[PDB]
Design a protein around this ligand. Structure first.
Ligand code: HEA
Ligand SMILES: CCCCCCCCCCCCCCCCCCCC(=O)O[C@H](COC(=O)CCCCCCCCCCCCCC)COP(=O)(O)OCCN
Ligand SMILES: CCCCCCCCCCCCCCCCCCCC(=O)O[C@H](COC(=O)CCCCCCCCCCCCCC)COP(=O)(O)OCCN
Ligand SMILES: [Zn+2]
Lengths: 124, 100, 48, 58, 56, 117, 535, 268, 236, 345
């Protein structure tokens, strides 16, 4: 009974010469009429052919999607820290100051421009 | 173009002539690939085809495909109240009575 | 000698210098040429 | 012999053990000047395309 | 009876086209009746107001 | 380089296909000047024997384990494309039968075996 | 000596495709670094990296155009996938003219030298990709820089023409025993339809370039308006090449996508005859429209109406292909492996890239969008997000068969998601900048256009990290690649079915619709000794 | 495939080429030509003897390809019925690309002739530029081209009826009727009153009748290698793929010349 | 008008042609939004129902009714789009009586404006040149790379015909708000028409590439009333 | 507003040739188009003096539109013959009124040949033409542009013509018009009785040579001389049509076909504006009736050819038939030297 019971925890560890003896001993017990098979043989014959081992494994396990997600997060964080360094060290011209973008609004108010949705040149 | 009453004669004829396990699983694989579900007569021939080739897992996996092909649950339980003398004579047990 | 390391022009295993140096220098030159071109043409035209 | 050496040079180009472009005892006169002058022609356009990068004209 | 099922995928296709068009027409009737027409109304009411000031 | 052939029963290689010479002052013909795979084809077409076949695969009978369709090869493998017994039903499925294993065509079920020539 | 007679003096078709791949990676790296140099100059207003020099900005843009239109997409989609796969699909041993394949490769390394030397020996060649005549004279660009850049469009043209004639003459008389020309796979039809346009499109470009060279150096006055010529002539003689060109880059992608939709959704392609007629109609209607690039030059009013009509007609055949791919994906079983995610990311980004061209096809709407960043935001969704994903999907599809070494699935997925996020961040605010009125080819811009230029410069640093991760994926493929077939079931070409047992599946593993995936995976040098047979 | 000793010969009728060094050397010669042509027109070299070496090496490399394609067909003997069909398909798809260069030059003339600009006072062939009269020497060229088109048919019709003296004569007379076309067209370039630069009309006339000149030197070379390969007994009465390609190449150039004579010499 | 900082949509219109362009774009975007939502919903359904599925329908591969529906339905959309495009192409132009002519000659890196009317007996035709105000010489509140030294001053409610040519290379006269974009090739004269309905200032920039200082050559159009135009002509 | 007329005429002749070439006891069905077109064509030349030009064009477009769809449901032989009838009528209306409109709006003789050379290129895409669903959408869009220009933007009355034209009886008595129509007759005599007779004993070379030849000789025939072009083209027709009995292989028939459709494409494009020149020089300037005569002399050949070709093939054989049609093609040509200068008025 030990060769048949609990094959769900040992089938992927046995070599390929002890796997072809369990199949060649359940293929001479299935020729008998059924109702004469034990419950463990019915479970083992199901797990051997239609079971989640070998070519029926999923592509993505649960412990792989976390790996992909956390590979993407530290793929975005590094680019943010590189881009921040090219942002402190900039050539800021004299026009991008708030006191220069508030004087232009008076000129655009006197000469009526954007009477629709809006004019505002302030972006600090 | 094919009708229900020609589908359910052609696949009975094709199930009553298989000789190996490859052929039984070949005919079973392209029977569940149409818009028409198999009749209770065709599935009655498939279990005897699995018996002649002496396989047990295929006779259980036939009943598992009926859960996915059939639209609702009441039709599925209508399939198991006609295919009951076939099951209890051959000895086939479902997956949800084994808990594998 | 047909096999999985037979159709490549370069050797991958059983080598004196490890493969990381020829793999890295390829991408380094490929990413460092158009900075050298910009350096030369910046220095030829007055600016630093 | 006669002008029909075609039934003689067709027994030489097959069973040779040398490549086709160097099988006859005449291909030296074709292959030595060509490969000699190609190594001067290529080495002349790599001396004038590095000299053009440094601004030197003639 | 309950043991005769003949067509299932065709009705799925007919429902899957008759929802993706109503949803698309719903998402296109908001670009033309909530983004477009009030802007035309605002543009016109600006021009029916600028002329009256010049008239007075 | 050796004795010249006359018909394709006396061709044991590329050494028997040089031919005689033409005469001075005439335009030579193709029975007097050809060596390789050109004279072999010419020597086949003057008898009725096609050296290079172009006949497609058999689509009359299906194939079992006891009576399988025999494909001829000069190697241990030959690529076989099945499209059905009415010859256009089965879609194009390719198979590699060998001298140790038989292909079985997952949709229709034809079996192919090697005849190693 | 055996190294020289197999990798320099070559005859085999599969031994040259690897050299196309190695050249393509180098020339795709150079242009990506030049695009990063462009994108850190257009970050905030002012003069930041290039100190004051408006040359070496147009030079960088021209060298970004040429190196990734002419040296990346065509060598990858013609050399690595056309030379390697097409004899294996049609069942031929080698191609018809092998020495022409060798010369078609070897004209490209000395085509790179002329272009890289065309960016050093004066201030440079800042004419743009379209080398317009009266700017490319002797009065603005006076030196051997534009000349050495227009000799790099001749050697590439000769290479493409010699490849196209080989591809047509191979598929006509080098088929197997029972393949008529209605049973060919779709990729062969794609290569054939591009190789006809390469015959019918390259002479007019060669004529235009040679006439420009004669105007520059032998004062012929074809395009000078002081002797009786017009610049507009050159524009015609460019764009008759120009619009077939942008289809030549996209047709070999489509066929690749078809194969992926056939295999990871276990269904045949919905209406393959519809696909081959659609490819034919798309190829034919790319010659009859070339003047929608010139709506502001001063055309007639009865000529605008024809060219608006003949451009919107091309929406009808492409929709057949899109809806056929959806109908192929509809019923089947789908597993999300790493070519299949690129296939799904092509069916949504090409359609948002192609619907903007119906907006740009109208002559009335083009007087608000011409020479404006809406055009750039148009053509990056169909160049960078339509063709490059096709190339990546083809590589991840066919690299275990060609090489025999597998790759890590997780790192490839991280690369795909980084490329998706960064490339969609970069190319979307260009539409907004185009709608607000930002012109093209400007180093400095007004202060209003700053904010989106801060966001579109953030995605480039996301995509270059994806390129570096792709480099590590190739390294992990080559070294210890024999043990990366048991980590995940991505190595399997096809999933076992519902009733197919594992014991039966291990005996009969590969079920295919082509000759490709039944070969041993290093393919043999002489693959077919006895001919292949087809019913 | 059931002949007795069949495995000793090839099982498919196609050619497997030996390894050759010529594709690399043609590319290295074209690199030298491209770089020296890009440099010598702007200084940087001075002497004009490097460009001539580049042109000479390109031509010698092409001739060295041609040597190896001749030996593989008349000596080694690998040209079956399929390979000849492939070479014919190949040659036709190059002649097709050769024609479409001339269509661009024809369209570059009709876009300037029909619709002339302001700067030229609107008149073709314009004021002060006398054209070439078509009732002179450009008739003798047309007559000798239609004579040469008829002389090559007598050369291909005498190799099928097995006459050797009658194939050499036709090819010799044809080669002497193409040298006179070149000689008449070089004496018509030294007795002309308008140059390359003095119009747009003198720009297209010397760019549609200058490419034709280069395409006609190739015919003199091609019929030289068809007379010399026939004197040394390489051509049989049913396997001659050198004559058929040069006959198809002569007739296309004749049809192109009859369109280079109506639109440039007559129409104005 | 001026560009706005975080812009999403078009600038404000001042000409009937730009209003027609806006209306046609908003008409096309209806059908394009419908098609994109249809394709997205089918992709969502395919992902949500048929992912890792046991049953594969490998025999639904022909179609005959459905293949005509995705050939005729995209055609009807093309005709419905094509009707107002042809009407707007043919209708709105200078049908009746243009009233002024302004010649805009495009030199290398600045613009030249002449007013072809207002001629004296000796050829006293009014002319000026528009340059770029540099960053060092800007006053408090002016716009960088858009502000010029002399601006083109036009009346309102008057048809204006722009004749554009060039003397060195190919340029492009572009004022976005007014709906004007025409080229300037060195050997022909191109013409466009504009009508301005409200007063204000309108900025524009060149489009076709010209060389080093392509980015600094703007166009500025002011629309005064008729009395101010008369007072402005008597000073220049 | 002149180029759109050329587009409409090109599309009308394209639909003409596609409906004529695509055919779906076969000689009773096949000869139904050109027989009705032989009769209907003089009537439109008199109708356009009453109703005007654009209304028969677009009415004919409507008639072919709802008659091709009616042909789809048609199964019985009477329904097929009454379906091919009125398809002939709509084709006749579109062709005659479109060529009249191009003759009306293009007054200069030099520009008229250049326009009609491009306009006659539509009678090769019917033989050549694929999917054919995109091209019909393109045709529908160009027809929308034509309707928008002619019926919506500017409204017009019925508008009878300003001058009454000469009747049809006095135009058939003019000798030069008969000589002009005789060339278009006898050039198509050789090409009509070949395609029904070819399966008893090609389309792409003829169509390509036609489309290449007509566009360039429509421009060149003015300064080259029209009668010289007619002589050269008709002699090339005769010499090319005699060479088919000598050829006995299908691969050898490619070279005469480039002989035929090229030279026919010459002799149309030089002889078709010369009738408008004859009408402008000798009579009053009304263009409908002379081009009705042109369409009669053009389309009588497709009616008469396939019916008589089998009878002559059973009578004398193929090389004799090809030789006598070559004799007919060559021997008419020296009459065209009469086209140097007609008597003026
Ligand atoms: C390589 C990719 C590619 C492709 C495939 C195409 C093909 C097309 N291109 Fe081309 N195009 C370029 C890249 C590409 N182009 C480039 C780089 C330029 C030059 C720009 C420059 O030089 O600055 C150019 C030139 C160019 C221009 C000129 C730009 C200008 O105004 O300055 C325009 C617009 O007029 C345009 C639009 C189109 C359209 C509509 C298609 C169509 O073929 C695409 C059609 C796609 C669809 C329509 C999607 C269909 C999906 C559906 C679900 C069907 C629904 C049905 C309906 C829409 C009715 N392209
Ligand atoms: C551009 C025009 C280039 C012309 C290329 C040759 C045109 C004919 C091509 C052809 O079919 O024949 C090739 C010969 O080419 C040749 O011998 C010459 C090819 C090299 C032309 C030089 C290109 C410079 C650019 C065969 O070539 P093959 O060796 O494979 O035939 C293998 C023998 N069975
Ligand atoms: C543009 C630049 C490239 C132009 C050169 C293109 C040449 C293409 C030649 C095509 C060869 C076709 C071919 O297979 O011919 C073989 C030999 O031909 C030949 O040997 C033909 C020789 C052609 C030489 C052309 C030289 C012009 C170069 C410029 C000169 C200035 C046949 O051999 P075969 O079958 O007839 O033998 C059988 C006897 N049993
Ligand atoms: Zn099968």
């Amino acid at each position: 009974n030990a060769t048949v019971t609990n094959l769900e925890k040992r089938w992927e560890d046995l070599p390929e010469t002890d796997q072809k003896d369990i199949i060649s001993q359940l293929s001479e017990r299935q020729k008998l009429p059924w109702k004469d098979l034990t419950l463990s043989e019915k479970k083992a014959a199901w797990y051997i052919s239609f079971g989640e081992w070998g070519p029926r494994r999923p592509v993505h396990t649960k412990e792989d999607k976390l790996y992909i997600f956390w590979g993407t997060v530290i793929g975005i964080v590094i680019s943010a820290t590189i881009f921040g360094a090219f942002r402190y060290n900039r050539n800021v011209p004299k026009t991008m100051n708030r006191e220069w973008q508030a004087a232009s609004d008076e000129y655009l108010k006197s000469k009526n421009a954007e009477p629709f949705t809006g004019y505002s040149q302030i972006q600090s | 173009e094919e009708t229900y009453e020609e589908f359910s004669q052609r696949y009975e004829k094709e199930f009553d002539e298989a000789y190996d396990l490859f052929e039984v699983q070949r005919v079973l694989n392209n029977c569940f690939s149409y818009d028409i579900v198999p009749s209770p007569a065709v599935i009655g021939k498939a279990l005897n085809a699995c018996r002649r080739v002496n396989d047990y897992a295929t006779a259980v996996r036939v009943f598992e495909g009926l859960k996915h092909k059939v639209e609702t649950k009441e039709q599925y339980d209508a399939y198991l109240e006609e295919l009951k003398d076939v099951r209890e004579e051959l000895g086939i047990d479902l997956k949800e009575e084994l808990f594998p | 000698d047909v096999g999985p390391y037979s159709n490549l022009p370069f050797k991958v295993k059983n080598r004196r210098v490890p493969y990381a140096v020829p793999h890295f220098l390829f991408f380094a030159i490929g990413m460092g040429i158009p900075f050298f071109a910009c350096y030369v043409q910046l220095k030829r035209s007055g600016s630093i | 012999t006669a002008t029909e050496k075609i039934i003689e040079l067709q027994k030489f180009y097959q069973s040779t053990n040398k490549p086709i472009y160097a099988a006859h005892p005449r291909s030296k006169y074709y292959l030595i000047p060509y490969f000699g002058l190609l190594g001067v022609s290529v080495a002349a356009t790599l001396f004038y395309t590095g000299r053009a990068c440094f601004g030197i004209k003639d | 009876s309950l043991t005769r099922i003949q067509g299932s995928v065709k009705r799925r296709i007919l429902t899957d086209i008759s929802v993706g068009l109503t949803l698309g027409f719903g998402f296109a009737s908001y670009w033309w009746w909530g983004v477009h027409k009030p802007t035309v109304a605002h543009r016109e009411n600006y021009y029916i107001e600028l002329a009256k000031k010049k008239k007075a | 380089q050796f004795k010249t052939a006359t018909s394709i029963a006396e061709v044991e290689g590329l050494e028997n296909l040089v031919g005689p010479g033409a005469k001075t002052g005439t335009v030579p013909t193709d029975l007097e000047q050809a060596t390789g795979l050109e004279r072999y084809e010419l020597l086949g077409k003057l008898e009725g024997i096609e050296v290079f076949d172009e006949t497609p695969l058999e689509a009359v009978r299906k194939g079992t384990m006891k009576d399988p369709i025999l494909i001829d090869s000069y190697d241990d493998y030959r690529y076989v494309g099945c499209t059905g017994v009415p010859a256009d039903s089965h879609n194009i499925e390719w198979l590699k039968p060998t001298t140790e294993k038989n292909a079985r065509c997952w949709e229709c079920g034809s079996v192919y075996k090697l005849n190693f020539l | 000596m055996n190294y020289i007679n197999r990798w320099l003096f070559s005859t085999n078709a599969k031994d040259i495709a690897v050299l196309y791949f190695i050249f393509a990676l180098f020339c795709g790296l150079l242009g990506s670094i030049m695009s990063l140099i462009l994108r850190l100059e257009l970050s905030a207003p002012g003069n930041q990296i290039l100190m004051g020099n408006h040359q070496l900005f147009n030079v960088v843009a021209t060298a970004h155009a040429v190196l990734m239109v002419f040296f990346l997409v065509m060598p990858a989609a013609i050399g690595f996938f056309g030379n390697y796969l097409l004899p294996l699909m049609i069942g031929a041993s080698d191609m018809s003219f092998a020495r022409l394949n060798n010369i078609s490769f070897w004209l490209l390394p000395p085509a790179l030298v002329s272009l890289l030397a065309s960016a050093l020996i004066e201030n440079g060649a800042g004419t743009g990709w379209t080398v317009y005549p009266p700017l490319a004279g002797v009065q603005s660009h006076s030196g051997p820089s534009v000349d050495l850049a227009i000799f790099a469009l001749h050697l590439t043209s000769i290479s493409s023409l010699l490849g196209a004639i080989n591809f047509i003459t191979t598929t006509l008389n080098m088929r197997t025993i029972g393949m008529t020309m209605s049973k060919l796979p779709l990729f062969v039809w794609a290569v054939v339809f591009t190789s006809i346009l390469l015959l019918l499109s390259l002479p007019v470009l060669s004529a235009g370039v040679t006439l420009l060279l004669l105007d520059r150096n032998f004062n012929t006055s074809f395009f000078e308006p002081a002797g009786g010529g017009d610049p507009i002539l050159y524009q015609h003689l460019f764009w008759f090449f120009g619009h077939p060109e942008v289809y030549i880059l996209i047709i070999p992608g489509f066929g690749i996508i078809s194969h992926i939709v056939s295999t990871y959704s276990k269904k045949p392609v919905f209406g393959a005859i519809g696909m081959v007629y659609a490819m034919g109609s798309i190829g034919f209607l790319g010659l009859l429209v070339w003047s929608h690039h010139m709506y502001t030059v001063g055309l007639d009013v009865d000529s605008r109406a024809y060219f608006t009509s003949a451009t919107m007609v091309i929406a009808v055949p492409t929709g057949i292909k899109i809806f056929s791919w959806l109908a192929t994906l509809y019923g089947g079983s789908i597993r999300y492996t790493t070519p299949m995610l690129y296939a799904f990311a092509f069916l949504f980004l090409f359609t948002v890239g192609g619907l903007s061209g119906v907006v740009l096809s109208n002559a009335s709407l083009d007087i608000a969008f011409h020479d404006t960043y809406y055009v750039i935001g148009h053509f990056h969704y169909v160049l960078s997000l339509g063709a490059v994903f096709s190339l990546f999907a083809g590589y991840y599809y066919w690299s275990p068969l060609i090489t025999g070494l597998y790759y890590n699935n997780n790192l490839a997925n991280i690369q795909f998601w980084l490329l998706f996020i960064g490339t969609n961040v970069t190319f979307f605010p260009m539409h907004f900048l185009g709608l607000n009125g930002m012109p093209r080819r400007i180093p400095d811009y007004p202060d209003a256009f700053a904010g989106w230029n801060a966001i579109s410069s953030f995605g480039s640093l996301i995509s270059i990290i994806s390129v570096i991760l792709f480099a590590y994926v190739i390294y992990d493929q080559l070294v210890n690649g024999l043990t990366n077939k048991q980590l995940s079931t991505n190595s399997l070409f096809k999933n076992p079915d519902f009733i197919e047992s594992n014991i039966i599946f291990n005996d009969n593993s590969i079920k295919s619709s082509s000759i490709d995936f039944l070969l041993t995976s290093p393919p043999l040098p002489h693959t077919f000794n006895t001919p292949a047979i087809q019913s | 495939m059931r002949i007795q000793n069949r495995e000793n010969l090839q099982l498919f009728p196609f050619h497997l080429v030996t390894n050759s060094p010529w594709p690399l050397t043609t590319s290295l010669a074209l690199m030298s030509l491209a770089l020296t042509l890009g440099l010598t027109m702007h200084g940087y070299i001075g002497n004009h003897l490097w460009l001539f070496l580049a042109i000479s090496l390109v031509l010698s490399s092409i001739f060295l390809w041609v040597r190896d394609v001749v030996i593989e067909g008349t000596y080694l003997g690998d040209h079956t019925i399929a390979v000849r069909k492939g070479l014919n398909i190949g040659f036709m798809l190059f002649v097709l690309s050769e024609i479409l260069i001339f269509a661009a030059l024809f369209w570059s003339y009709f876009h300037s002739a029909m619709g002339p600009t302001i700067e030229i006072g609107c008149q073709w062939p314009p004021v002060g530029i006398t054209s070439i009269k078509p009732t002179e020497l450009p008739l003798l060229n047309t007559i000798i081209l239609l004579a040469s088109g008829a002389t090559v048919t007598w050369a291909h019709h005498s190799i099928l009826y097995k006459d050797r003296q009658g194939t050499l004569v036709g090819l010799f007379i044809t080669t002497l009727l193409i040298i006179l076309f070149v000689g008449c067209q070089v004496l018509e370039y030294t007795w002309a009153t308008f140059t390359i630069a003095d119009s747009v009309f003198g720009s297209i006339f010397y760019a549609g009748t200058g490419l034709h000149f280069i395409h006609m030197v190739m015919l003199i070379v091609m019929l030289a290698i068809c007379y010399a390969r026939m004197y040394f007994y390489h051509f049989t009465s049913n396997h001659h793929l050198g004559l058929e390609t040069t006959i198809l190449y002569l007739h296309v150039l004749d049809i192109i010349w009859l369109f280079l004579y109506i639109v440039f010499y007559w129409w104005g | 008008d001026v560009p706005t900082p975080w812009g999403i949509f078009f600038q404000d219109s001042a000409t009937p042609n730009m209003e027609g362009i806006i209306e046609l774009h908003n008409n096309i975007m209806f059908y394009l939004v419908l098609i994109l939502t249809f394709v997205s919903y089918i992709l969502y359904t395919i992902i949500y129902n048929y992912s890792n599925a046991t049953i594969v329908h490998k025999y639904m591969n022909h179609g005959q009714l459905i293949e005509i529906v995705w050939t005729t339905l995209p055609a009807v959309i093309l005709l419905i789009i094509a009707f107002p495009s042809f009407i707007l192409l043919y209708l709105c132009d200078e049908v009746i009586s243009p009233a002024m002519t302004i010649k805009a000659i495009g030199l290398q890196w600045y613009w030249k404006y002449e007013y072809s009317d207002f001629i004296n007996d000796d050829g006293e035709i009014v002319e000026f040149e528009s340059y770029v105000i540099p960053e060092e010489l800007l006053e408090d509140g002016q716009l960088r790379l858009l502000d010029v030294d002399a601006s083109v001053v036009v009346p309102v409610d008057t048809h204006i015909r722009f004749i554009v040519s060039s003397a060195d290379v190919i340029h492009d006269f572009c004022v976005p708000a007014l709906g004007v974009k025409v080229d300037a090739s060195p050997g022909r004269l191109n013409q466009t028409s504009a009508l301005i309905q409200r007063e204000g200032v309108y900025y524009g920039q060149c489009s076709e590439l010209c060389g080093v200082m392509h980015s600094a050559m703007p166009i500025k159009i002011e629309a005064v009333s008729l009395y101010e135009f008369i007072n402005w002509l008597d000073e220049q | 507003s002149r180029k759109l007329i050329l587009f409409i005429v090109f599309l009308a002749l394209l639909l003409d040739n596609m409906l004529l070439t695509v055919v779906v006891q076969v000689g009773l069905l096949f000869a139904s188009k050109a027989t009705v077109q032989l009769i209907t064509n003089p009537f439109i030349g008199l109708l356009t003096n009453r109703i005007g030009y654009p209304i028969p064009i677009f009415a004919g477009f409507c008639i072919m539109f709802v008659s091709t769809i009616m042909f789809a449901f048609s199964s019985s032989y009477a329904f097929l013959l009454i379906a091919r009838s009125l398809q002939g009528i709509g084709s006749s209306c579109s062709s005659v009124a479109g060529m009249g409109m191009l003759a009306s709006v293009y007054t200069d003789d030099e520009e008229r040949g250049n326009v009609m050379g491009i306009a006659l290129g539509g009678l090769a895409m019917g033989v050549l033409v694929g999917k054919t669903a995109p091209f019909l959408v393109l045709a529908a869009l160009v027809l929308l542009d034509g309707a928008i220009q002619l019926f919506v933007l500017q409204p017009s009355r019925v508008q009878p013509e300003s001058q009454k034209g000469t009747p049809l009886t006095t135009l058939l008595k003019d000798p030069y018009i008969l000589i002009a129509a005789g060339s278009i007759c006898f050039a198509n005599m050789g090409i009509a009785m070949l395609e029904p007779a070819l399966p008893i004993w090609a389309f792409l070379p003829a169509s390509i040579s036609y489309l290449i030849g007509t566009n360039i000789f429509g421009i060149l025939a003015h300064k080259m001389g029209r009668w010289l072009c007619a002589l050269l083209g008709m002699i090339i027709v005769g010499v090319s049509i005699l060479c088919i009995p000598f050829a006995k292989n299908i691969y050898g028939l490619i070279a005469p076909n480039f002989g035929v459709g090229f030279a026919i494409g010459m002799v149309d494009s030089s002889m078709m504006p010369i009738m408008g020149y004859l009408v402008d020089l000798r009579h009053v300037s009304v263009y409908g009736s002379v081009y009705a005569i042109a369409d009669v002399a053009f389309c009588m050949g497709y009616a008469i050819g396939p019916s008589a070709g089998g009878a002559i093939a059973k009578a004398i054989g193929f090389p004799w038939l090809m030789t006598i049609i070559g004799i007919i093609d060559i021997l008419f040509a020296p009459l065209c030297f009469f086209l140097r200068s007609p008597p003026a008025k």
